[PDB]
């Protein structure tokens, strides 16, 4: 299906009372006119409709769109990206199982793996974002391989097909976090991944307000994630926030295109600047990763990082505090132009003392280039 | 603890821009003017403020009010009752542990325990809602006792102090689901429970719209639930819904008192009706459970159940389809007058074919009496 | 109909998709499956549904309830109490017309009358809240009599039936602002008033968040107010706020009863306190107005005023700033316990330098009594 | 004026609690710590903050952004476009005054003028959207000229500078409805208009949900509109909706550029189609109006109209009912692709039986081309 059909019409043929904006079904429950119908609702896995820890008319419309965008059979919205990640992981794991996890996965994904390994008999091997290392860490007990591409902070790309070929051969399940690219620029289901997750907090909502996660994949997986993890743990998204996602989704293609255009300008400037050591933005044609990246992605988002020429946390501090346009904050995926130096985090690797992450928003990239330029001028050569 | 102070003023002395309604902080993030402040935010457990999977100004006000109502040191709002239950359970259990769970706990609580039991090395003993049976099922590996009082569907009360006395002697943690009473009518922290959970979906929001859970307890437990389970699994409540809980809270005492008044009228009617076998409403003074109940609770809510004199599902269907005021729906805790016969559920015990749960709302209880009365007229007398 | 049927079930038999909470129809527009239907929508006065400056499914449910509560045939929700007042006034007036307006009407109602009289050929006589003075001010050109009872600030009651008898005889239209009592405690349509208005900002919403107004009356009046004033001026209420009113309405009877109970306690204390000259709360049995008030009202709300023994704005300031529970703010009608001394206003009459208005909320009235007591002790005898 | 600075940063330097999304101040009121401050609030025109029929922190941020986009000194958000129009009109008119109103103004604007004319001593001259006809209708009692460019339904452009040159010489005030272009593509303040109004219902919100109006202009006018009309008539916008306008504003430039690109494709197709008589889209370079239009506008929106070669309402019905992508609905300004034939309206001029208005949204314009194309195939060729 076309992106535009998905964003602007799919699922919207028949709306209650012929409203054109889908109504917000901010209800816990739904009444029944008959006992028989109520009994069906309380026996079947997914009756439409019975209860908010369950399907919701507003939320389902958005889920239907998101699934179609990821070319998955089904999707579910949940309260956060971490709900999507943690529930997906729980679905695929039991006592005695092993997981291979890329060691540049989002920090809280790794924290969750560590939490399960401390509390239960789950073994985790952390490996670099390198398909060969990933397949080398597979054991006879491996049930899950957890991917992210591009990775967190360092924006490294993995050869996904190489991993999923091996996984598929061995009946090992794969989960990928595709938040960085959005569905506009990468569709990992088509690269053979079983389940795709997003922090919809970032690009899918796009406005730095809603917190939400998406789990997408095949009917069998998603039916079981729904009736087991979702119903038992209950990370329900507010239908008001689902409606806000729908609203945000309308501009997703326009926004992603803008971020890509802007990120090319900013990454080009950073790559050529004498005070920047290196730039991590895999969809710039001059990137060392471009050939692999562009084999898997149709564009890149606004998120990138780069390294200063220093190992001094103090020089990094000088730099970031000198920025007048980029704002110091976490999160990303909106109009906001954001900066975070990795050295701010307690668990920052020593190697990444010099690593700065920026998010390029929806405005005039020359303003961002000038901000970076003036700040770079203020640190010593 | 003063209820009105908590509902109407606690935490509200200083509000951004001197607004009287607390603003809705519907933001993912918060900016920093200083690298040093940002570093503190990204190293410390709970910086105010940095990120939505984190503390939020709107949500934290409501949390502080809820903790104070429960006379607990701290509380967190989460996306549903099941989030409050599941995260609390996970906080207290690891591989090799045992749990005692009352077998009339809310269905999804039991489903979660069974999920854990199937997936990990967690063993669960299910016991009747009887303090003695609960304590008897303790083993040397028991790390959690999971309570609910009154219980789901049957509204059975448990001697909570008898359980917590035993648990505390053995360093076993307790969790209780206090949704039924609300914090107005029961405060199990004062009965020795470690962690109190609610489905704020029900009475605390009170308007059949928001879905939310509450976890409340001591500083140590709550700090760890926050930094471990909440940040890892992320069942974050929308600040918009937090604000709607705040709005609903303002009438919580008024609503709870009205439900209790109404429930007395309805339960009295059912108790005296020839075609009703029995009524499960433990805060009616004629209830067999009243002495124990009234030692732990200062009132009762609108939720009750009763049995018809029958073993026929079809007769229960006849009765429920005859009602014109009560509406067939799940959930409860609002103005809505709701009915669900337990036999509608696939996993209904055989014994509970005749069990009907009703929720008495905020209106004229005589309308509910008349509705029940006209429905009871249309079913046949039981065979003798 | 019973209050409880109105609050809890009227209009809620059939809700889209069987939700029990009425969905929020936050839509500008509605699609049509046929040209014929669209043509009807664009020809008829009130098609269900076509456009948000028009009927809305969410808003209409709340309007239906409000009308039934006021025992009026129809009602409309608008953006503020002043929208309800100003549109009602415009409906009844044209060039060359005269109005009698009670001179203790809400200040902005009087400002609006003054605005019309400056800009257009509208003459206004302001009179005390006294039915005899009101009927004495009627001229052959009088088209409207504007009432409020109890009045603003001074909480005076008018004999409404005496006014409406005379008005009805002369084909003069009446509008009353019934915000003070709420529909729970007074239903002026039953006392013969043509159109009833409320600031739903106050008790009807009840939570100090929504701003909204209600216009209620007969079909003929309301049909014309809708198609003329409402459509031309457009003070549309957000359906999100309508839904919040519906939510608030659920507790309206519980809240009004509580406010009345509390106000009796506080008014009794004020009446007996040696530093209070007089108390304006007409539904206290010891009030000089009680016989008339209780002939028209079934109870009283939380709003009252009282006078200190002083003509010093400074002593009033001392008093109000000494209160630690009552908060200095305008508005009223919620849980909030609020105080405003009339002398704070620029246009405060000299006579009212000593007049304090308080709103008694939903809590323990002894806390309010103790606050007043301690503050009263701190001013000189 | 820098568009991106306005959309993305202006006014957002300091936000309560350092939130990055501005909080929703859904409050009626604000408390005071001091009697003196409360007295200032209740005497002054515009205290920050005191009451919702008043300034609001959320709404004021959006207002300041909108004023800056229009290059006006101040702006106020109100409950609908018609509130912005009606209050602006009332501000400039009193008993005995005359107004010149373009006769292709939005229908409800004309209805309001007629309402005023019927009720009070206000006289109105309706004129074609032609600067010369407008200026010719000026009288010694004219106090207001009411403009809209492009006009409703027919998308006619007016030489605004010719009108404002005349008005300014005679101390006559001008109001213009700039909804069609949005502030991205036309800024009539720079063309000499006194007060600019929008239905933010349409492009400024841009998502077919919020209803809102904007009034923008100089300090003097806006201060008086605020303290007189706005506080007296009270068409207050919900802060929740203000926040949704803020959210919609972030993509305003992206959306407007896309509508323009799409509208060029669709208008080019219609212009070259044998069964279309004419196309009203003044920012297509082949439009007869393009030279005047492009002197005042930097782009065009998605709204256009065109005529079929027919005088038959039934043929227009045939065509519109044949469309499968465009949806029959009023309003415009979002992603929605909408159609309304003017003959659907009861008051449609006879000349406009063949006039069809379409709104081109944010998708693939070729889908719209194909839909129009397949519909045009199914109507008969015009008689010759």
UniProtKB/Swiss-Prot annotation, chains A, C:
The modification N6-(pyridoxal phosphate)lysine is found at residue 202. InterPro entries: Cys/Met-Metab_PyrdxlP-dep_enz, Cys_met_metab_PP, PyrdxlP-dep_Trfase, PyrdxlP-dep_Trfase_major, PyrdxlP-dep_Trfase_small, Trans-sulfuration_enzyme-like. One of its GO terms (cellular component) is cytoplasm. It holds the Pfam family Cys_Met_Meta_PP. It comes from the Bacteria. Keywords: Cell shape, Isomerase, Lyase, Peptidoglycan synthesis, Pyridoxal phosphate. Pathway: Cell wall biogenesis; peptidoglycan biosynthesis. GO terms for biological process: peptidoglycan biosynthetic process; regulation of cell shape; transsulfuration. Gene3D superfamilies: Aspartate Aminotransferase, domain 1, Type I PLP-dependent aspartate aminotransferase-like (Major domain). Optimum temperature is 70 degrees Celsius for the cystathionine beta-lyase activity. It catalyses: L-alanine = D-alanine; L-glutamate = D-glutamate; L,L-cystathionine + H2O = L-homocysteine + pyruvate + NH4(+). Homotetramer; dimer of active dimers. Catalyzes the racemization of L-alanine to D-alanine, and of L-glutamate to D-glutamate. The activity is low, but likely physiological since T.maritima lacks canonical alr and murI genes, while D-alanine and D-glutamate are essential components of peptidoglycan. Also displays a more efficient cystathionine beta-lyase (CBL) activity, cleaving cystathionine to homocysteine and pyruvate; however, this reaction seems not to be physiologically relevant since T.maritima possesses an O-acetyl-homoserine thiolase (MetY) that bypasses the need of CBL for methionine biosynthesis. This is L-alanine/L-glutamate racemase.
């Amino acid at each position: 299906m076309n992106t535009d059909d998905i964003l602007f019409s799919y699922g919207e043929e028949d709306i209650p009372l012929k409203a054109l904006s889908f109504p917000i079904f901010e209800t816990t429950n739904f009444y029944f006119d008959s006992f028989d119908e109520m009994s069906k609702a309380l026996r079947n896995g997914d009756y439409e409709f019975v209860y908010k820890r369950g399907s919701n008319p507003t939320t389902r419309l958005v889920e239907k769109k998101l699934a179609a965008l990821e070319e998955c059979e089904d999707a579910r919205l949940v309260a956060s990206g971490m709900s999507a990640i943690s529930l997906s992981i729980l679905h695929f794991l039991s006592s005695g199982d092993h997981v291979v996890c890329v060691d540049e996965a989002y920090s809280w994904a790794k924290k969750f793996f560590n939490y399960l390994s401390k509390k239960f008999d789950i073994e985790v091997s952390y490996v670099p974002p390198d398909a060969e290392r990933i397949v080398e860490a597979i054991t006879k007990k491996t049930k899950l391989i957890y991917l992210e591409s591009p990775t967190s902070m360092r924006m490294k790309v993995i050869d996904i097909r190489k991993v999923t070929e091996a996984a598929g051969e061995l009946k090992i399940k794969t989960v990928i976090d595709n938040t960085w690219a959005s569905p506009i620029f990468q569709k990992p289901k088509l690269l053979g991944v079983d389940v795709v997750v997003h922090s919809a907090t970032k690009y899918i909502s796009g406005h730095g307000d809603v917190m939400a996660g998406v789990i997408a994949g095949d009917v069998e997986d998603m039916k079981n994630i729904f009736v087991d993890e979702y119903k038992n743990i209950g990370p329900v998204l507010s239908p008001i926030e689902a409606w806000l996602i729908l609203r945000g989704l309308r501009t997703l293609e326009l926004r992603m295109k803008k971020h890509y255009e802007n990120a090319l300008v900013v990454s080009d400037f950073l790559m050529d600047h004498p005070k920047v050591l290196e730039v991590n933005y895999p969809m710039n044609p001059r990137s060392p990763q471009y050939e692999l990246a562009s084999s898997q992605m149709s564009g890149g988002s606004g998120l990138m990082s780069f390294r200063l020429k220093t190992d001094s946390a103090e020089k990094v501090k000088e730099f970031v505090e000198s920025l007048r346009v980029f704002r110091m904050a976490v999160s990303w995926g909106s109009h906001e132009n954001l900066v975070v130096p990795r050295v701010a985090y307690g668990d920052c690797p020593k190697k990444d003392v010099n690593l700065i992450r920026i998010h390029v928003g929806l405005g005039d990239p020359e303003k961002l280039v000038e901000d970076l330029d003036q700040a770079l001028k203020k640190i010593a050569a």
